Amino acid sequence: SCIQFTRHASDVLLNLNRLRSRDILTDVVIVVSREQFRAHKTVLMACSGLFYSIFTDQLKCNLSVINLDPEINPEGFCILLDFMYTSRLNLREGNIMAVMATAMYLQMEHVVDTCRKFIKASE
Amino acid sequence: SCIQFTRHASDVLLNLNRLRSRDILTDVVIVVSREQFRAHKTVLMACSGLFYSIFTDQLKCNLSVINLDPEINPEGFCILLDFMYTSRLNLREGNIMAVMATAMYLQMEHVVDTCRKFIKASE
Amino acid sequence: WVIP
Amino acid sequence: WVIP
Numbered sequence: 638s639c640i641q642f643t644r645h646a647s648d649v650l651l652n653l654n655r656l657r658s659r660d661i662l663t664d665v666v667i668v669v670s671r672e673q674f675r676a677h678k679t680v681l682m683a684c685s686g687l688f689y690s691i692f693t694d695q696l697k698c699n700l701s702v703i704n705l706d707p708e709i710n711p712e713g714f715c716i717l718l719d720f721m722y723t724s725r726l727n728l729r730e731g732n733i734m735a736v737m738a739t740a741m742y743l744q745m746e747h748v749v750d751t752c753r754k755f756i757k758a759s760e
Numbered sequence: 761s762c763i764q765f766t767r768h769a770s771d772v773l774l775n776l777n778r779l780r781s782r783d784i785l786t787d788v789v790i791v792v793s794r795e796q797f798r799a800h801k802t803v804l805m806a807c808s809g810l811f812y813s814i815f816t817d818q819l820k821c822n823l824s825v826i827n828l829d830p831e832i833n834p835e836g837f838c839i840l841l842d843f844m845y846t847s848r849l850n851l852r853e854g855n856i857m858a859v860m861a862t863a864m865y866l867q868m869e870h871v872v873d874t875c876r877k878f879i880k881a882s883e
Numbered sequence: 884w885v886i887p
Numbered sequence: 888w889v890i891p
């Protein structure tokens with residue numbers, strides 16, 4: 638018999654992105670080649686099959702630094718991290734290949750789906 | 761020029777609630793009289809003006825235990841914590857007064873609004 | 884607020 | 888996915 642506040646989930650995510658922008662309670666740095674990205678482990682796990690696996694691991698759960706595969710593109714990661722915190726994906730002709738490869742590695746199935754559909758439409 | 765995934769914010773919140781149920785990466789215990797509630801500080805701040813103030817404080821940000829005012833009803837808190845993690849509010853005749861008082865203390869304006877409207881309709 |  |  639619950640009632641539901643439609644905008645609640647979006648409002649929560651907006652405040653989680655505000656915390657990220659202000660670097661409040663971030664508990665991990667994701668290292669992608671020469672670049673570093675601060676984030677909240679809980680948000681990363683909630684969005685990515687890869688981070689969900691990493692941070693449920695009894696040893697990796699306590700690491701403050703995670704190094705991604707050297708093939709991972711920093712811009713692609715940046716675009717996906719922004720998506721995690723906002724629901725918005727900056728998908729462009731010049732970045733689609735890097736975004737799709739990063740989304741496959743991070744196990745973000747909905748992003749992979751759409752990248753596949755956008756590429757198919759251009760061929 | 762971003763695209764947006766409609767269900768993303770809800771999917772994130774569902775996974776944050778799964779983390780709470782499994783007690784993964786919870787970093788605070790909220791003590792309400794004889795009862796204890798484990799949660800994630802980031803979610804509490806994202807939902808509540810009171811917790812936002814508490815956890816931006818340079819000393820309170822590092823506490824693992826927060827004791828609420830002894831006037832706070834544990835069931836009312838439980839209902840509001842469930843709401844924070846699900847967008848669903850278990851608002852009933854028998855709990856509405858406690859829920860509204862807890863929501864005022866926690867500074868959860870949308871919940872206070874609806875409690876006010878539901879009480880007004882019964883008078 | 885809605886009836887979900 | 889939508890155009891926001």
Ligand SMILES: N#Cc1cnn2c(Nc3ccc4c(c3)CC(=O)N4)cc(Cl)nc12
Nearest residue numbers: 682683684685686689745746775778779
């Ligand atoms: N507890 C918990 C919890 C925290 N996070 N999380 C999941 N995170 C996840 C796992 C796989 C995938 C995605 C997110 C997006 C995607 O495409 N695949 C799943 C579950 Cl079943 N549970 C949890």
Ligand SMILES: N#Cc1cnn2c(Nc3ccc4c(c3)CC(=O)N4)cc(Cl)nc12
Nearest residue numbers: 652655656805806807808809812868869
């Ligand atoms: N950074 C950050 C950040 C984390 N959380 N958070 C806010 N949390 C909040 C503050 C006040 C109220 C509510 C939530 C619900 C309500 O009724 N009042 C606000 C801002 Cl402006 N910023 C942040």
Ligand SMILES: [Cl-]
Nearest residue numbers: 745746747748
């Ligand atoms: Cl996704």
Ligand SMILES: [Cl-]
Nearest residue numbers: 868869870871
């Ligand atoms: Cl609220």
